[PDB]
Design a protein around this ligand. Structure first.
Ligand SMILES: OC[C@H]1O[C@@H](O[C@H]2[C@H](O)[C@@H](O)[C@@H](O)O[C@@H]2CO)[C@H](O)[C@@H](O)[C@H]1O
Ligand SMILES: OC[C@H]1O[C@@H](O[C@H]2[C@H](O)[C@@H](O)[C@@H](O)O[C@@H]2CO)[C@H](O)[C@@H](O)[C@H]1O
Ligand SMILES: OC[C@H]1O[C@@H](O[C@H]2[C@H](O)[C@@H](O)[C@@H](O)O[C@@H]2CO)[C@H](O)[C@@H](O)[C@H]1O
Length: 151
């Protein structure tokens, strides 16, 4: 239940509900993977969805149009959230977009099934831990919800 399907063949930004910031992937400067206020649109904020197959049917890899890298989410090693080359070669590259309901209609969590984690974008901690992950089979918070933007 609760599968969300992003559009294919069009780039999008991923904006956090709690943070009003969009994810990004760049090779420089550091940090390479972080988030940015949504009012400022930059080339590192654009991603496409790569459909999965087999046990990953209904999941997607999140591929940067800016670096070519896909996002990952894992419990260890550090860093727990980042990016890596390819088109989803590793299990922790495969996300179920887990559809929200109620106040979260329109939004989804980004659940890395293989690591049992969800992505987080928040402003309630210092910058070193504003973009991170959290166990997926645990409490839900607004900072785990994202939506797709085309501007
Ligand atoms: O889309 C991300 C933009 O980030 C801007 O740099 C940020 C940086 O990420 C942050 O760590 C801090 O230093 O503030 C910077 C300025 O807002 C880049 O300037 C911009 O080009 C984008 O990469
Ligand atoms: O999908 C990500 C994979 O990352 C691999 O670790 C990388 C690490 O992220 C990077 O910083 C550098 O140290 O190279 C490592 C090896 O490619 C993990 O080994 C793999 O299991 C995935 O998590
Ligand atoms: O949705 C993420 C939640 O994170 C919780 O904070 C964690 C934090 O991420 C971790 O680094 C460590 O400090 O443990 C904290 C408590 O589990 C927040 O409590 C919650 O509000 C969300 O932000």
């Amino acid at each position: 239940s609760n599968e969300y399907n992003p559009p294919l063949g069009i780039a999008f930004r991923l904006c956090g509900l709690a943070s009003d910031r969009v994810l990004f992937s760049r090779v420089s400067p550091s940090p390479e993977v972080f988030h940015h206020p949504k009012s400022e649109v930059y080339p590192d904020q654009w991603f496409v969805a790569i459909p999965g197959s087999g046990q990953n049917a209904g999941c997607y890899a999140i591929k940067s149009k800016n670096t070519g890298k896909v996002l990952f989410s894992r419990m260890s090693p550090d860093p727990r959230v980042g990016h890596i080359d390819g088109d989803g070669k590793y299990p922790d590259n495969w996300f179920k977009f887990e559809a929200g309901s109620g106040k979260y209609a329109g939004y989804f969590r980004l659940r890395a099934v293989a690591s049992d984690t969800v992505l987080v974008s928040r402003t309630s901690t210092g910058t070193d831990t504003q973009v991170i992950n959290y166990p997926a089979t645990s409490a839900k918070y607004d900072d785990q919800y994202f939506t797709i933007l085309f501007d």
